[PDB]
Write an enzyme that holds these catalytic residues in place. Structure first.
Site, PDB file in Angstrom:
ATOM      1  N   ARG A 124       0.925  -1.059   0.035  1.00 19.43           N
ATOM      2  CA  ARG A 124      -0.102   0.173  -0.130  1.00 19.43           C
ATOM      3  C   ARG A 124       0.733   1.078  -0.015  1.00 19.43           C
ATOM      4  O   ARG A 124       0.864   2.088  -0.929  1.00 19.43           O
ATOM      5  CB  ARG A 124      -1.107   0.076   1.155  1.00 19.43           C
ATOM      6  CG  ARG A 124      -2.071  -1.045   1.226  1.00 19.43           C
ATOM      7  CD  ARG A 124      -2.788  -1.540   2.428  1.00 19.43           C
ATOM      8  NE  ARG A 124      -3.084  -2.870   2.455  1.00 19.43           N
ATOM      9  CZ  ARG A 124      -3.550  -3.263   3.685  1.00 19.43           C
ATOM     10  NH1 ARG A 124      -3.531  -2.642   4.567  1.00 19.43           N
ATOM     11  NH2 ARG A 124      -4.072  -4.586   3.681  1.00 19.43           N
ATOM     12  N   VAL A 125       1.670   1.178   0.943  1.00 17.20           N
ATOM     13  CA  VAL A 125       2.784   2.386   0.694  1.00 17.20           C
ATOM     14  C   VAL A 125       4.107   1.638   0.618  1.00 17.20           C
ATOM     15  O   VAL A 125       4.422   0.674   0.787  1.00 17.20           O
ATOM     16  CB  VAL A 125       2.790   3.244   2.316  1.00 17.20           C
ATOM     17  CG1 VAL A 125       3.336   2.135   3.436  1.00 17.20           C
ATOM     18  CG2 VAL A 125       3.618   4.465   2.440  1.00 17.20           C
TER      19      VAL A 125
END
Ligand SMILES: Nc1ncnc2c1ncn2[C@@H]1O[C@H](COP(=O)(O)OP(=O)(O)OP(=O)(O)O)[C@@H](O)[C@H]1O
Ligand SMILES: Nc1ncnc2c1ncn2[C@@H]1O[C@H](COP(=O)(O)OP(=O)(O)O)[C@@H](O)[C@H]1O
Ligand SMILES: [Mg+2]
Ligand SMILES: [Mg+2]
Lengths: 493, 466, 70, 50, 468, 49
Positions: A354-355
């Site tokens: 996600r990040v």
């Protein structure tokens, strides 16, 4: 100085009548008696009236009714600092490698509230795992929490140890917390770390399967406290102060099982799958401490790589979904791919970060975006490949290119690759400079190409590494240099 | 010591002791039974003021509340040494065979010992050459590693059990331990006595080279729970002597079920199938003293009954967490192959990696598995279409797969219904090259049916010469 | 009153020593319920467990030296 | 290498025995010298501490 | 006042007070804790002999028995007003951003207030345009109505919430309130701060019109258990004075989970799967305050985490009846990279009625559900036998159903990092037109691969034409 | 035999025994006054091993 007496030694929980002025998470001592030379500690947690139930950090076989206890005046804490580096230690911080006592000046409490929200920053610096597939398709940034979820023998520990090995000159302090693993496995892992020289910057916290369930429940918190000491204060590594740490919590499914045992033996109500109601809180308070602090709060980071073992490829279980909802991504290792020879087994379809996609070297993203695209093409066309070459020619070439890329991602164990090597290899593979190479020979082609660059063209690798941060990585000079290098190698071959 | 029984509920008693000198946990309190015999109960918990809750590990039907209880001051003592070789014991270490008692001069160690420390573990994993052909090739053992055998009432389980002891004695020290956890009194004790005593190698019975421990079906949950630890305690003496020991545990799942029953009787809350909350810790107390240390090593082989067909069941799951190899006896191949019926596709091994067993062994094993997988895929086609529709370059592989599935036969030194073929002990070095040559075109001339219990590729050439 | 002292010194104490110990307890009450076990293994001191607080000046520095050295 | 490790194993027990014996003899020196230096004069330290 | 701690069970602190000075049920009692900072516990149950049970709402892992407890005499009061705009608060209302503390002159309100009466309820409802095709077609959001996004762990709940904020939080016509209860402190906040301070409506960022309370997962159970009420107290002041409020609460499920943990520590008898016996009552106490009344409207938009993929779990089961528009995110759809991942069959809305949303919209949505149903019924038939055994019309509806499944996929501005395609804002009218055209037969010749991650039907046609 | 020789050298008091005993006494018992009353010969007098 304050004392109490054991009035009942239960299922790994002593009762400790009359121990007032003990704090709610104190570490009690049980000073040594005849037949027991060493002290074994416990955590006073249920501070009820005229009784202080305490979980025994060790085998309960050795304590007895009427045994004295001595509150140490300290919340449960572990030694931290530079002295832990290269030491295999107990969750309590006591050494078990036998090299000698742990030297430390300060001890940080385990089980603290994570730094928070404002004390954070979006991850920007990458963590080079050294695996082509992970570094190219699931980038990991410093301070990111990337779950390594798989199915028993799939290579999860192998991926984590490859990552730990690759952080040699990367200014990172690795931590490996073995929770519930077999002592033979932890010994083999420590041997692997030592033979490759990665022990000089690695801490190991070992709570093996034989150890009491009180241990294996504070093991990840002990490792995380050490990692937090690295993150906030920092340690001197290679003469340079490093405030970045990487912690492998190893099997957190065994951590959850240990906490389930601790809860049920405390007669706490069971929840879903017989786990306590706060198992999610257990893993969340553990993992949320792994952060990327902003420049105001030191600028350090703590990368977490929790490992979850799934049963029969069931990612929709309770603990796996808990950790997926806690962490920032998944490196899903498939058993079918693992058995099919794709030893770095990686379900590229559902493994995600996600990040940290932004926390990648610009060269890596500029070269690997189309790699992800081509792998998506191959996964889409695998369904249509059931027809015996009835599709059209250009998509057959796409399928062949995807097969070559998949063979390229296959990487042997214990051989991490520097980022310059990875990006050069992916540049070669993605510029259609491998379409003439037969599929079975691609791994040897990659190895020979990397040996050629190491020996024949050090300058090309240095130039690629120096020019990895710029916005537009395929600059004309590096483009032509790498083009000349690969054309020379292919002519030689 | 000298407590009194306070309360008896089934096989869970509570003995009251003085405020001082209370028994510790797992202290093996002993109850005289009005004669030479006695009831040994294991302390599992300390309560109140001097009250300890213990599991009976015996009949506990003649007891009355108030009887004298004697605290032994240590876990259940178990006789160890060569005095235990060729003898059969129950959980408490008393002999249950016809011979007399062990006697006081023999060392007695606590049943509850700690595993080898971290520094004593072996850094590098080494193959435990068994002597089998299919196993030493497809599912190699690990020295000091746990191995599973599946299939339930398959075929070749018992003969492999005796052959491993025979080979371990021939190659390694030889001493072996059989831990009959929940072993049937008829099926698993008298019959196995006869099988071990009748099986002979170099004028030595396999029984004389093994020590057997039996926690029977009829014994309470505590006995079946701690019989595995009794067997470990007996094996660890010989391990500490530097010898290589093979520990056989019959249906580790019955150890798990005994632990579950003990936890249920103790009043602990259940866990995830109703199993004990301390499933991981109990399975770690056992199967973690089974390791290869610097001095000696205890390799193991544990039969595992998967509840129904659910391997994800907490019991087989926690067992698989501690396994280094798996052998899968299958009924279909057992229909005709009463020689080791290991399904090569379903039997795996952690140590079968290039780094450990070498590159040649890994290459040969992978090629054999590839050929057998091709035959498995084409089995339906052969059944439906026939041999003629099957094209060239695969008919060769199907014939080769038939021959190689037939070449997983081994002539044993000791066997059930002895076929008369001389015993053979084939090292891994011989097996790898033999199967490599079988895969290298050689042996395509001899017909498929003449591979019954041949043993080696040199023997294959010798058989073809005749 | 209700506090209970548990003194344990190496050698058995004379009456004057016992009275000196009781006077030592004037900080709490003077004469609390005090029980003098011998415990000859400990040397060179007395463990005064007044209430739920112990005072260790007997043998335990040397045994800490043992703990570190071993 | 393994023979060096085995020799250290015997030396490890001997080293632990030597350390324990040295420390125990140091303690017994206090125990033996206690009678001459004063049998029950240790109460002074406890009074100040308590 | 001036009580003493008797027992410390987890984050449940039992304190004894003088017989005539016992705290009330929801008063906030304080342990001094030394160092000049205090630990604020919330009472929950009045036991015998001035004994009360309080929830710590803090670390509570370094404090002993017998410690002094000070009774404030009033419940947890949190600041309200324009002073809370553009600020970030704790469960206790103490700011945690770098700015200074809220001054005494700012009004403080209790977090335990009665919900609006039946007379105050606002029945008026109209479609709220979100720009997301599947949400705008199958389960249209209501302006001033509660809606929630249900989903497991990996499915895109938070990305849906972030795209929703990026879409509708610029044209607010009012303020907004965000409440990431038990959410990741990485993405839940400090990554939403970046976008809320990057978005600029008019000389003022979206953050400048936002009150924000976190109580992230790192926090102990009490903070997660009362942070929702703190945020609702922040929002209710603005609702009562007429300002339209956008309320985003994250994973209401962690509110319920913290309640369950606190109840377990409180000695209550567990209900169903280890959940608190007072599950429905706590849920109602939280959710009946999320209502658009006559004075003002709150356009709530919640997220809900289902244990694993379980939708029969008590927490989402209690949530489902507290909503106007329901959205269900499926693990299977997300694994297929149809990342908006909304299940059209399990997603409904109250304003999917031809009088409100329009006759053509209603017809298209109902047809897109009928077709979707046909495919779910024929799923096994296709799975084992194959596509060819179906009738011609069944085959056509199956192909159209697969095209519809692919077409609900939509790139998001916030999800541009995952799918390289730029975000697409599809108005509800264009969504209705696109799906009406898709059902009419137009686009049948197009391969299904061209409906993936597109905007309206015109983009699909353009992609097909560019592919020829 | 090598360990026997090393242990014989150690058991020889002059190697470490008297020094360790004196250091421990000065550290724990008395402020550099371990001998205190008498103990002049008693010091290491019974240090048989
Ligand atoms: N990239 C790789 N290339 C080759 N072999 C590999 C690779 N990764 C793992 N292996 C092998 O796979 C086997 C299992 O690896 P590993 O120890 O990482 O397992 P795991 O996923 O941690 O499982 P377990 O739950 O048993 O710990 C080992 O033989 C290891 O050597
Ligand atoms: N529009 C989208 N495009 C691509 N991927 C998406 C999109 N929406 C969600 N995702 C995927 O969902 C994941 C994040 O899910 P998230 O919103 O964090 O759910 P949860 O909050 O329940 O964990 C990301 O890894 C991303 O790949
Ligand atoms: Mg592993
Ligand atoms: Mg995201």
């Amino acid at each position: 100085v304050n004392v109490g007496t054991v009035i009942a030694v239960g299922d790994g929980v002593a009762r400790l009548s009359g121990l007032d002025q003990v704090v709610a998470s104190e570490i009690v001592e049980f000073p040594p008696k005849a037949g027991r030379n060493e002290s074994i500690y416990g955590i006073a947690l249920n501070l009820e009236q005229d009784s202080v139930a305490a979980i025994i950090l060790g085998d309960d076989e050795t304590i007895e009714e009427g045994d004295m206890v001595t509150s140490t005046g300290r919340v449960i804490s572990v030694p931290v600092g530079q002295g832990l580096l290269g030491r295999v230690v107990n969750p309590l911080g006591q050494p078990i490698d036998g090299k000698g006592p742990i030297v430390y000046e300060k001890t940080r409490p385990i089980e603290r509230i994570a730094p928070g929200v404002i004390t954070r920053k979006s991850v920007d610096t990458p963590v080079q795992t050294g695996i082509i597939a992970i570094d190219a398709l699931i980038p990991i940034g410093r301070g990111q929490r990337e779950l390594i979820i798989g199915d028993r023998q799939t290579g999860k520990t192998a991926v984590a140890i490859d990552t730990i090995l690759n952080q040699k000159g990367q200014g990172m302090v690795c931590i490996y917390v073995a929770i519930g693993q077999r002592r033979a496995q932890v010994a083999q892992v420590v041997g692997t770390l030592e033979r490759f020289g990665a022990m000089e910057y690695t801490i190991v916290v070992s709570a093996t399967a034989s150890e009491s369930a009180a241990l294996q429940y504070i093991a990840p918190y002990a490792g995380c406290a050490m990692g937090e000491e690295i993150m906030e204060n920092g340690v001197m590594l290679n003469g340079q102060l490093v405030k970045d740490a990487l912690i492998v919590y190893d099997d957190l499914s065994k951590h959850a099982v240990a906490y389930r045992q601790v809860s049920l033996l405390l007669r706490r109500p069971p929840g879903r799958e017989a786990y306590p109601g706060d198992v999610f809180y257990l893993h969340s308070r553990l993992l949320e401490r792994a952060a990327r602090l902003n420049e105001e709060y030191g600028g350090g980071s703590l990368t977490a790589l929790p490992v979850i073992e799934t049963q029969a490829n069931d990612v929709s279980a309770y603990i796996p979904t808990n950790v997926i909802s806690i962490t920032d991504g998944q490196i899903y290792l498939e058993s079918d791919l693992f058995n099919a020879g794709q030893r770095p087994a990686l379900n590229v379809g559902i493994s995600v970060s996600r990040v940290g996609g932004a926390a990648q070297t610009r060269a890596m993203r500029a070269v690997a975006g189309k790699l992800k695209g081509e792998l998506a093409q191959f996964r889409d066309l695998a369904a249509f490949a059931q027809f015996a070459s009835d599709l059209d020619a250009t998509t057959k070439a796409q399928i062949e290119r995807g097969q070559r890329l998949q063979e390229l991602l296959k990487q042997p164990q214990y051989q991490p690759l520097p980022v310059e090597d990875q990006v050069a290899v992916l540049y070669a593979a993605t510029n259609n400079y491998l379409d003439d190479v037969p599929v079975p020979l691609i791994t040897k082609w990659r190895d020979d190409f990397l040996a050629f660059l190491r020996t024949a063209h050090p300058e090309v690798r240095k130039l690629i590494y120096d020019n990895r941060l710029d916005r537009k990585f395929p600059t004309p000079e590096v483009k032509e240099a790498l083009e000349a290098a690969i054309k020379e190698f292919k002519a030689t071959s | 010591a000298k407590g009194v029984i306070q309360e008896i509920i089934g096989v869970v008693i509570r003995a009251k002791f003085p405020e001082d000198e209370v028994p510790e946990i797992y202290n093996a309190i002993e109850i005289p039974l009005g004669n030479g015999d006695r009831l040994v109960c294991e302390v599992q918990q300390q309560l109140g003021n001097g009250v300890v809750k213990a599991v009976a590990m015996g009949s506990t039907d003649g007891l009355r509340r108030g009887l004298e209880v004697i605290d032994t001051g240590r876990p259940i003592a178990v006789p160890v040494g060569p005095a235990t070789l060729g003898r059969v014991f129950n959980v408490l270490g008393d002999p249950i065979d016809g011979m007399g008692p062990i006697g006081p001069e023999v060392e007695r160690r606590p049943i509850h010992r700690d595993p080898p420390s971290f520094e004593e573990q072996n850094t590098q994993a080494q193959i435990f050459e068994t002597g089998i052909k299919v196993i030493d090739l497809i599912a190699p053992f690990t020295r000091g590693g746990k191995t599973a055998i599946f299939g339930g009432a398959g075929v070749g389980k018992t003969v492999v059990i005796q052959e491993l002891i025979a080979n371990i004695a021939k190659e390694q020290s030889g001493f072996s331990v059989f831990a009959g956890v929940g072993e049937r009194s008829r099926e698993g004790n008298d019959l196995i006595h006869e099988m071990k005593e009748a099986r002979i190698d170099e004028n030595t019975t396999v029984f004389d080279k093994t020590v057997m421990v039996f926690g029977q079906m009829n014994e309470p949950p505590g006995a079946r729970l701690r019989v595995g630890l009794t067997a470990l305690t007996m094996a660890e003496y010989f391990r500490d002597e530097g010898r290589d020991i093979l520990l056989f545990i019959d249906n580790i799942f019955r150890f798990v079920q005994a632990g579950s029953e003990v936890s249920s009787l103790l009043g602990r809350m259940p866990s995830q199938v109703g199993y004990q909350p301390t499933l991981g810790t109990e399975m770690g107390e056992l199967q973690e003293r089974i390791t290869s240390t610097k001095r000696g090593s205890i390799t193991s082989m544990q039969a595992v009954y998967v509840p129904a067909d659910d391997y994800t069941d907490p019991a087989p799951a926690t067992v698989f967490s501690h396994l280094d190899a798996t052998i899968s006896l299958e009924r279909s191949i057992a229909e005709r192959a009463i020689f080791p019926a290991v399904d090569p596709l379903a039997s795996t091994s952690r140590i079968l990696d290039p780094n450990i067993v070498g590159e040649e062994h890994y290459r040969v094993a992978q090629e054999v598995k590839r050929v057998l997988q091709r035959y498995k895929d084409l089995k339906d086609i052969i059944a439906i279409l026939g041999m003629e529709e099957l094209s060239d370059e695969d008919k060769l592989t199907v014939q080769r797969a038939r021959k190689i599935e037939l070449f997983f036969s081994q002539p044993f030194t000791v066997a059930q219904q002895f076929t008369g073929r001389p015993g053979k002990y084939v090292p891994v070095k011989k097996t790898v090259e033999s199967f490599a040559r079988l895969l290298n075109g050689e042996g395509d001339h001899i017909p498929e049916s003449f591979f019954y219990m041949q043993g080696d590729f040199d023997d294959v050439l010798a058989a073809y010469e005749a | 009153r209700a506090v209970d002292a548990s003194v344990t010194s190496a050698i058995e104490l004379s009456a004057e020593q016992k009275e000196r110990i009781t006077r030592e307890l004037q900080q709490r009450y003077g004469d609390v319920h005090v029980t003098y076990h011998v415990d000859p293994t400990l040397i060179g001191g007395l463990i005064i467990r007044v209430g739920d607080q112990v005072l260790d000046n007997s043998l335990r520095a040397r045994l800490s030296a043992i703990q570190r050295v071993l | 290498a393994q023979a060096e490790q085995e020799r250290i194993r015997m030396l490890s027990e001997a080293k632990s025995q030597i350390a324990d014996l040295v420390t125990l003899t140091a303690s017994r020196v206090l125990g033996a010298e206690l009678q001459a230096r004063g049998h029950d004069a240790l109460i002074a330290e406890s009074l100040a501490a308590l």
